[PDB]
Design a protein around this motif. Structure first.
Motif, mmCIF file in Angstrom:
data_model
loop_
_atom_site.group_PDB
_atom_site.id
_atom_site.type_symbol
_atom_site.label_atom_id
_atom_site.label_comp_id
_atom_site.label_asym_id
_atom_site.label_seq_id
_atom_site.Cartn_x
_atom_site.Cartn_y
_atom_site.Cartn_z
ATOM 1 N N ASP A 21 -3.825 10.284 -2.764
ATOM 2 C CA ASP A 21 -4.115 8.879 -2.482
ATOM 3 C C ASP A 21 -5.454 8.478 -3.097
ATOM 4 O O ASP A 21 -6.511 8.938 -2.656
ATOM 5 N N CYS B 235 -7.208 5.085 -6.000
ATOM 6 C CA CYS B 235 -6.993 3.784 -6.615
ATOM 7 C C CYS B 235 -6.795 3.949 -8.113
ATOM 8 O O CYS B 235 -7.322 4.877 -8.730
ATOM 9 N N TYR C 177 -4.340 -6.807 0.375
ATOM 10 C CA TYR C 177 -3.819 -5.588 -0.228
ATOM 11 C C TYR C 177 -4.898 -4.558 -0.528
ATOM 12 O O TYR C 177 -4.595 -3.531 -1.145
ATOM 13 N N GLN D 262 -4.536 0.305 -4.602
ATOM 14 C CA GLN D 262 -4.385 1.482 -3.763
ATOM 15 C C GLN D 262 -3.041 2.159 -4.008
ATOM 16 O O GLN D 262 -2.114 1.582 -4.580
ATOM 17 N N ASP E 285 0.429 3.695 -2.589
ATOM 18 C CA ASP E 285 1.358 3.500 -1.483
ATOM 19 C C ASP E 285 2.570 4.395 -1.680
ATOM 20 O O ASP E 285 3.153 4.425 -2.767
ATOM 21 N N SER E 286 2.951 5.114 -0.629
ATOM 22 C CA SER E 286 4.105 6.002 -0.694
ATOM 23 C C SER E 286 5.377 5.278 -0.264
ATOM 24 O O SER E 286 5.802 4.316 -0.903
#
Lengths: 186, 110, 119, 119
Positions: free
Chosen positions: B26, B28, B60, B107, B109-110
């Protein structure tokens, strides 16, 4: 904690250190702020890059017909002016940021290297652990090779040269790349 | 640590997925976003850059830091040029046009 | 230079009021110096590079009638020579797009590159 | 890695396919001097290019306990393969002394190799 800022002048940056909610919340003008005291491997060992099992260079080489049969869109085409006897440029530094595991597998961009296979075999031992990488053993200056990889559908074409030490005159070191650019635009 | 591993082995070593590595995934990433049909489509038609920045950051967690702007966008006459130039960190009152791209840090996101 | 000047400055040629300005970074030797001295009233030489716009401004390429580019017929790599000459053409046309250019090409497949220059 | 080496000699060589021979027999004969019993002989492992070591091998093939790891003295994986932390001695030699022009820069490889092993 240290923080990184983008600003026109260093005088405004000190306001991030001198800020206080007591006597600056009501202040609207920023220039009025003062100093008042009030089971299967998919990533590498560290898990920050996409990883795949090592593969021989024979399995990634495409012929012109084979490249034409497959459909490439939204990919990256790296044209290289390499040679069997020329300085290595370290193509892994181009491929690691593009396999950075911030991206999902479906978001990864296919990378096609267009250039001499004698040069690229000397690079392949650092690039064979990345998933979607292919080779067209041709020339960046030939239009047939560029049409085989669908250069009109790529997200980016990157033109690089490796024979910088051979050319003596400094201004003539860019003749290949410039010509390549003028070819693709026409 | 990855530098030391690569120095030791002269290669990149695979590994099995663990919760620590998946958490390390995780981060950016750098991206460009268009204002033609996104959630900021209404705001990109003559709105200010600061409102876009605040809305993206608040909703976001997106950090906008520049405009990739079509070169012939200030001309009254139409043009066929698709070249764009870079405007780094525009002010709050900077005016947006619908044919603009936004540099952003997005970011994971899964 | 000797062959070009022998045909260009022929004695039977009709009176043409055209001077010749050579631009080259390599300084001439004794034989070239003597040849330039023999035509001192029609031929001038200047040390400089075509790829440098300051040198192009020096020889007044913006008011020249034409630019003539000669090739090295005795070189190890003809393709490198052709690419260098094409880049010289690109530089001259970037400085002044309307000037007439006559260039020498070694290999036939290289002159297609000239069609990639819109000027 | 499978074989266990302890109390051996590791000879790291910065050789090449086209470089002056250094005469490695002069290193191996004193270590096979028959003053020592067979069990007292120290194993010798040469770490370096096989193109150079094949050219050396025609004077070294009559000595009992000599092995080759065809790699690089600058790679830590090769050094861990030969158990360099258990050897009696590591000997670092260079063969490309004629190629380098500057005298002080002739030792850059060996010095770096030393600083690698110590770290």
């Amino acid at each position: 904690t240290l923080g990184f800022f983008i600003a026109s002048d260093a005088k405004e940056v000190k306001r991030a250190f001198f800020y206080c909610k007591a006597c600056h919340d009501d202040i609207t003008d920023p220039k009025r702020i003062k100093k008042c005291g009030c089971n299967v491997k998919k990533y590498d060992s560290t898990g920050m890059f996409h990883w795949c099992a090592p593969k021989e260079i024979e399995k990634v080489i495409l012929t012109r017909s084979e490249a034409a049969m497959t459909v490439l869109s939204g990919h990256v085409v790296v044209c290289i002016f390499g040679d069997v006897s020329s300085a290595l440029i370290g193509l892994r530094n181009l491929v690691m940021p593009l396999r950075a595991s911030n991206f999902h597998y479906h978001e990864l961009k296919h990378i096609v290297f267009v250039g001499s296979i004698e040069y690229l075999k000397r690079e392949w031992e650092t690039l064979h652990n990345f998933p979607k990488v292919s080779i067209l053993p041709g020339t960046p200056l030939s239009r047939a090779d560029l049409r085989a990889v669908n250069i009109n559908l790529c997200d980016m074409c990157v033109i690089l040269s490796a024979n910088q030490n051979n050319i003596d005159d400094t201004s003539l070191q860019d003749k290949e790349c410039i010509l390549a650019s003028l070819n693709i635009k026409s | 640590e990855l530098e030391a591993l690569i120095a030791e082995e002269n290669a990149l070593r695979g590994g099995y997925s663990t919760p620590q590595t998946l958490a390390n995934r995780d981060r950016c990433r750098v991206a460009q976003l268009a204002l033609l049909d996104g959630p900021f489509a209404d705001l990109g038609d003559g709105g200010c850059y600061g409102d876009l920045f605040c809305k993206a950051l608040k909703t976001y967690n997106m950090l906008c830091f520049g405009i990739y702007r079509l070169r012939d966008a200030h001309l009254s006459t139409p043009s066929q040029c698709t070249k764009r130039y870079v405007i780094t960190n525009p002010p709050y009152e900077f005016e947006l046009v619908p044919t603009d791209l936004i540099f952003c840090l997005m970011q994971f996101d899964s | 230079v000797s062959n070009f000047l022998k045909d260009f400055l022929h004695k039977d040629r009709d009176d043409v009021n055209v001077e010749i300005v050579f631009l080259h970074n390599i300084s001439p030797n004794l034989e070239l110096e003597a040849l330039f001295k023999r035509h001192f009233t029609q031929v001038e030489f200047y040390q400089g590079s075509v790829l440098n716009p300051h040198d192009l401004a020096r020889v007044k390429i913006e008011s020249a009638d034409a630019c003539l580019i000669l090739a090295n017929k005795y070189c190890a790599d003809p393709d490198a020579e052709d690419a260098s000459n094409i880049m010289r053409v690109i530089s001259i046309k970037n400085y002044h797009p309307k000037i007439r250019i006559i260039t020498q090409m070694l290999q036939y497949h290289n002159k297609a590159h000239l069609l990639n220059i819109p000027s």
